[PDB]
């Protein structure tokens, strides 16, 4: 009862920060902004795949089921990261330490509506005082609960959901006795995460189809996955 | 402890069944199918607005906040209804007793992908053995948790969420002692409901823009709401 092992484990499994490194030789444009974001996402995806192996039971799934979960959840994981990094900021999104977007920049990149939705997620989590413990557990839950149409072992995936849900419940029962409904409140933030992710995916799929922004192999693979 | 009053209340507040009444004089087409569905939805929307007043604290919200919740949640409520009606069927959606769509009909109407997503929701709820008690409580939660950008009294809306979340938790603690994580499992079905609803809204917005399917006042009002 010092607190949940799965939560502790997810905390130590947390990947190091990644830099966006916008090209200082390129003039600022919508194409620059979007090229930078997609490049950053491609590198994050590598780290996410590595991170997932630390989740209890994930590496025991078939490679196919592992990839199905990742192909469904990837954008929710990416978004939750930016959301968390942005918690101590106001009306700004911390994509990286060297890449913090305010309203004007979002307009320039054509991302005003998308970044406003992400800011809505930030707003909700701020008022809830989302902790790192909660963030890492929610990223794991979003992976397990990602609703892929293509799952082979449905029951094993449901088991993984249950293991991580239990970790959230246990953590909340021990750490937040003042609110016995905090775990459920955390789970009730997942629909807006799903909604914002669905919008981000279609948006960047549209950018992919327009052909003006170069994208790397892994990002494209994730983007080109079937719903 | 016979069981939760809010749940009992929602049960008696449950609206009577509505008929689709496809026009028997009109030849079957995609336009007929979609005209019928949108007409049915328009009449359901009237009943949903009436139903919401029975939810504790809802009518105490300002008219603006009431309408914001409804304009964000309406499609999730409509979808959850079809999902529930379809639970004892296989690969068919019971839009109404006189309007049950199989795969072929969905293809004809251009709804294959949408109806497959709704069937995924059905599949999950079947395996969970979703009860009417749970269905009615989830419709209410989806309304309160609908994530409108336009809320005036955020704290009152959060209170409504909490009241209905508490009802779900209490019901599950009393009725399903074999699974102390069933309430959370119910909440973890809301992201796919949100996802499917977002897709249904854009789809029918596209149909609205094409101008070939006539739609009524209230349905259009709900469709024309800002995200
Ligand atoms: C490019 C992408 C997918 C993005 C950018 C803007 C809005 C939504 C997603 C992104 C990139 C990096 C990241 O950490 C999170 C998301
Ligand atoms: C027309 C609409 C919004 C619909 C139809 C097909 C797929 C998704 C939504 C609908 C209509 C009636 C209904 O009970 C639930 C949904």
- Residues from chain B that touch A145, judged by Cβ atoms under 8 A, are 188, 191
Compute the distance between CA of residue B113 and CA of residue B106 in angstroms, rounded to an integer. Answer: 8
CA B145 to chain centre: 13
Tokens of A41: 């996402």
Question: What does each C-alpha distance from A194 to A83, A187, B50, B127 come to in angstroms?
Answer: 13, 12, 29, 22
Q: How many CA atoms lie within 13 A of B138 on its CB side?
A: 29
**CB B78 less than 6 A from any atom of ligand 2:** yes
Question: What does each C-alpha distance from B129 to A13, A147, A182, B86, B134 come to in angstroms?
Answer: 36, 18, 25, 12, 10
**CB B186 less than 6 A from any atom of ligand 2:** no
Looking up tokens 């997620």 gives A121
Compute the distance between CA of residue B108 and CA of residue A71 in angstroms, rounded to an integer. Answer: 30
Q: Which of A113, A154, A184 sits opposite B184 (nearest CB)?
A: A184
Tokens of B95: 């839009």
Tokens of B194: 């949100």
> Are A31 and A109 in contact, with CB atoms under 8 Å apart?
no
SS3 call for A96? strand
Compute the distance between CA of residue A124 and CA of residue B147 in angstroms, rounded to an integer. Answer: 10
Looking up tokens 């009615």 gives B136
Tokens of A142: 């979003």
Compute the distance between CA of residue B167 and CA of residue B137 in angstroms, rounded to an integer. Answer: 8
Ligand 2 atom 8 nearest Cα: B200
Compute the distance between CA of residue A6 and CA of residue B106 in angstroms, rounded to an integer. Answer: 44
Q: How many CA atoms lie within 13 A of A150 on its CB side?
A: 15
Pick the closest to residue B125 from B52, B188, B195, B75 (CA basis): B188
**CB B95 less than 6 A from any atom of ligand 2:** yes
Residue ranges lining ligand 1, Cβ < 6 Å: A 37-38, 40-41, 44, 78-79, 81-82, 95, 111, 114, 200, 204
Tokens of A67: 């990839």
The size of chain B, in residues, is 227
Compute the distance between CA of residue A66 and CA of residue A51 in angstroms, rounded to an integer. Answer: 12
Helix (H) or strand (E) holding A94: strand A93-96
**CB B80 less than 6 A from any atom of ligand 2:** no
Pick the closest to residue A91 from A75, A102, A107 (CA basis): A102
The secondary structure of chain B as a DSSP string is ----HHHHHHHHTPPPP------TTSPP-HHHHHHHHHHHHHHHHHHHHHHHTTSTTTTTS-HHHHHHHHHHHHHHHHHHHHHHHTTTSSS-EEEETTEEE-HHHHHHHT-HHHHHHHHHHHHHHHHHT--HHHHHHHHHHHHHT---TT-S-HHHHHHHHHHHHHHHHHHHHHH-TT-TTHHHHHHTTHHHHHHHHHHHHHHHHHHHHHT-S---HHHHHHHTS--
Buried b (16+ CB within 10 A) or exposed e, A73-102: bbbbbbbbbbbbbbeeeeebbbbbeebebe
Min distance A57 CA to chain B CA atoms (Å): 19
Encode A159-182 in three state secondary structure: HHHHHHHHHHHHHHHHHCCCCCCH
Q: Spell out the residues 6+ positions from residue A202 whose beta carbon is closer than 8 angstroms to its own.
A: none
Angstrom resolution of this structure: 2.0
Q: How many CA atoms lie within 13 A of B48 on its CB side?
A: 28
- Residues from chain A that touch B227, judged by Cβ atoms under 8 A, are 113, 117
Compute the distance between CA of residue A160 and CA of residue A204 in angstroms, rounded to an integer. Answer: 30
State the closest ligand 2 atom to the C-alpha of B75, by its place in the atom list counted from 1.
3
SS3 call for A208? helix
Tokens of B151: 């809320």
Fold of B1-227: Retinoid X Receptor (1.10.565)
Tokens of A215: 């994208």
C-alpha A7 to ligand 2 mean position (Å)? 40
Pick the closest to residue B101 from B51, B40, B180 (CA basis): B40
> Are B148 and B156 in contact, with CB atoms under 8 Å apart?
no
Looking up tokens 């209230």 gives B218
> Are A85 and A6 in contact, with CB atoms under 8 Å apart?
no
Listed as own residue / partner, the contacts of A196-201 with beta carbons closer than 8 Å and 24 or more positions apart are A196/A79, A196/A114, A196/A117, A196/A118, A196/A120, A196/A121, A197/A75, A197/A76, A197/A79, A198/B195, A198/B198, A198/B199, A199/A113, A199/A114, A199/A117, A199/B198, A200/A75, A200/A79, A200/A114, A201/A75
Experimental method: X-ray
CB proximity under 8 Å: A 190-209 to B: 190-195, 198-199
Minimal Cα distance from A195: which residue of B? B195
In eight-state DSSP terms, residue A33 is H
Sign of CA dihedral B39, B43, B49, B55: negative
Sign of CA dihedral B209, B113, B77, B102: positive
**CB B96 less than 6 A from any atom of ligand 2:** no
Compute the distance between CA of residue B69 and CA of residue A153 in angstroms, rounded to an integer. Answer: 37
SS3 call for A99? strand
Is B28 buried (19+), middle (13-18) or exposed (0-12) by CB count in 10 A?
exposed
């Amino acid at each position: 009862k010092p607190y949940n092992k799965i939560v502790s484990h997810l905390l130590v499994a947390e990947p190091e920060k990644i830099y966006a490194m916008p090209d200082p030789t390129v003039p600022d444009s919508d194409i620059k902004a979007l090229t930078t974001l997609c490049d950053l996402a491609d590198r994050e995806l590598v780290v996410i795949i590595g991170w997932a192996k630390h989740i209890p039971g994930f590496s025991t799934l078939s490679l196919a089921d592992q990839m199905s979960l990742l192909q469904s959840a990837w954008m929710e994981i990416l978004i939750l990261g930016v959301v968390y990094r942005s918690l101590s900021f106001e009306d700004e999104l911390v994509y990286a330490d060297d890449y913090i977007m305010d309203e004007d920049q979002s307009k320039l990149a054509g991302l005003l509506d998308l970044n406003n939705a992400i800011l809505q997620l930030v707003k909700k989590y701020k008022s809830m005082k989302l902790e790192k413990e909660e963030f890492v557990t929610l990223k794991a839950i979003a992976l397990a609960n990602s609703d892929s149409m293509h799952i082979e072992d449905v029951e094993a995936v449901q088991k993984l959901q249950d293991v991580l849900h239990e970790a959230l419940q246990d953590y909340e029962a021990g750490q937040h006795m003042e609110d016995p409904r905090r775990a459920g409140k955390m789970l009730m933030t997942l629909p807006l995460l799903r909604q914002t992710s669905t919008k981000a995916v279609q948006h960047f799929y549209n950018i992919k189809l327009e052909g003006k922004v170069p994208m790397h192999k892994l990002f494209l693979e994730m983007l080109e996955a079937k719903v």
